Amino acid sequence: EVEALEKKVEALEFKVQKLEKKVEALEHGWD
Amino acid sequence: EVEALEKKVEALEFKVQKLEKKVEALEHGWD
Amino acid sequence: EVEALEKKVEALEFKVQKLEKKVEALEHGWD
């Protein structure tokens, strides 16, 4: 179970960092 | 603890997939 | 491992709630 969770969590961290960068661009009107 | 985590993680996965779809719409100007 | 995960998960929950609020503003044209 634990390694299953660790994989999912690392995958969410990536996805969430991607979402933060996109949303920061939309809020700041970048590019 | 572990099942507590598994629930939270599955809940984040749902929420993150919802955020990806919304942000993809905003970036693409869908609809 | 488990506490390492619990910290990361709580950190994602915060980050995801922040992203939900920002994206809801962008979708609703708030402010």
- DSSP of B12-30, one letter per residue? HHHHHHHHHHHHHHHHHT-
Amino acid type, B4:
A
Q: CA–CA separation, C29 vs C31, rounded Å?
A: 6
End-to-end CA distance of chain A: 42
Considering only CB atoms, which chain C residues are within 8 Å of A16?
12, 15-16, 19
Q: Do A9 and B6 touch (CB under 8 A)?
A: no
Determination technique used = X-ray
Q: What Rg do the C-alpha atoms of chain A give, in angstroms?
A: 13
How far from chain centre, in Å, is Cα C21?
8
